[PDB]
């Protein structure tokens, strides 16, 4: 266990973290999720990312620092959760995950839950701090 990197902003609080992890889990089961920094980057480049989740304890943190920049340029919501171990479990994997992307599906059974998370993230972004 490690504390969130100072560059890991915005950081979802405990409540938002659980909300995010639960949606990530449902997205994993519905195969509406991409895992890893590279796969996440590609969803952004393709415009198929509803939102990006990153681990604040990613080490080294540099491997994912391009994501906040990319999301800001693409107007895509992004947030950091405190644990890569927890995000890994939510992704339905026995390994830590440092980045994940919930992909687009307007007919998704969990569309409303994804939209709810997006709105929460967007509100956080409005409250200061940008990577640019
Ligand atoms: Mg830019």
From Swiss-Prot:
GO molecular function: RNA binding; U3 snoRNA binding; U4 snRNA binding
Main localization, broad class: nucleus
Pfam families named in the record: Ribosomal_L7Ae
One BP annotation, GO: maturation of SSU-rRNA
Keyword field: mRNA processing, mRNA splicing, Nucleus, Ribonucleoprotein, Ribosome biogenesis, RNA-binding, rRNA processing, Spliceosome
InterPro entries: eL8/uL1-like, H/ACA_rnp_Nhp2-like, Ribosomal_eL30-like_sf, Ribosomal_eL8-like_CS, Ribosomal_eL8/eL30/eS12/Gad45, Ribosomal_eL8/Nhp2
GO cellular component: box C/D methylation guide snoRNP complex; nucleolus; nucleoplasm; nucleus; precatalytic spliceosome; small-subunit processome; spliceosomal complex; U4 snRNP
Subcellular location: Nucleus, Nucleolus
PANTHER family (alphabetical): RIBOSOMAL PROTEIN L7AE FAMILY MEMBER
Family according to the record: Belongs to the eukaryotic ribosomal protein eL8 family.
Biological function: Common component of the spliceosome and rRNA processing machinery. In association with the spliceosomal U4/U6.U5 tri-snRNP particle, required for splicing of pre-mRNA. In association with box C/D snoRNPs, required for processing of pre-ribosomal RNA (rRNA) and site-specific 2'-O-methylation of substrate RNAs. Essential for the accumulation and stability of U4 snRNA, U6 snRNA, and box C/D snoRNAs.
Subunit structure: Binds to the C'/D and B/C motifs in U3 snoRNA. Component of the U4/U6-U5 tri-snRNP complex composed of the U4, U6 and U5 snRNAs and at least PRP3, PRP4, PRP6, PRP8, PRP18, PRP31, PRP38, SNU13, SNU23, SNU66, SNU114, SPP381, SMB1, SMD1, SMD2, SMD3, SMX2, SMX3, LSM2, LSM3, LSM4, LSM5, LSM6, LSM7, LSM8, BRR2 and DIB1. Binds to the 5'-stem-loop of U4 snRNA. Component of the ribosomal small subunit (SSU) processome composed of at least 40 protein subunits and snoRNA U3.
Protein's recorded name: 13 kDa ribonucleoprotein-associated protein
Species this chain originates from: Saccharomyces cerevisiae (strain ATCC 204508 / S288c)
């Amino acid at each position: 266990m490690s504390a969130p990197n100072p560059k890991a902003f915005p950081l979802a609080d405990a409540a938002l973290t659980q909300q995010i992890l639960d949606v990530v889990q449902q997205a994993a089961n519905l195969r509406q999720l991409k895992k890893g920094a590279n796969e996440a980057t590609k969803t952004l480049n393709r415009g198929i990312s509803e939102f990006i989740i990153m681990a604040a304890d990613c080490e080294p943190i540099e491997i994912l620092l391009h994501l906040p920049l990319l999301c800001e340029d693409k107007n895509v919501p992004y947030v950091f959760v405190p644990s890569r171990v927890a995000l890994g479990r939510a992704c339905g994997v026995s390994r830590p995950v440092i980045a994940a992307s919930i992909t687009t599906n307007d007919a998704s059974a969990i569309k409303t839950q994804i939209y709810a998370v997006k709105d929460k993230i967007e509100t956080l972004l409005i409250l200061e701090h940008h990577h640019h």
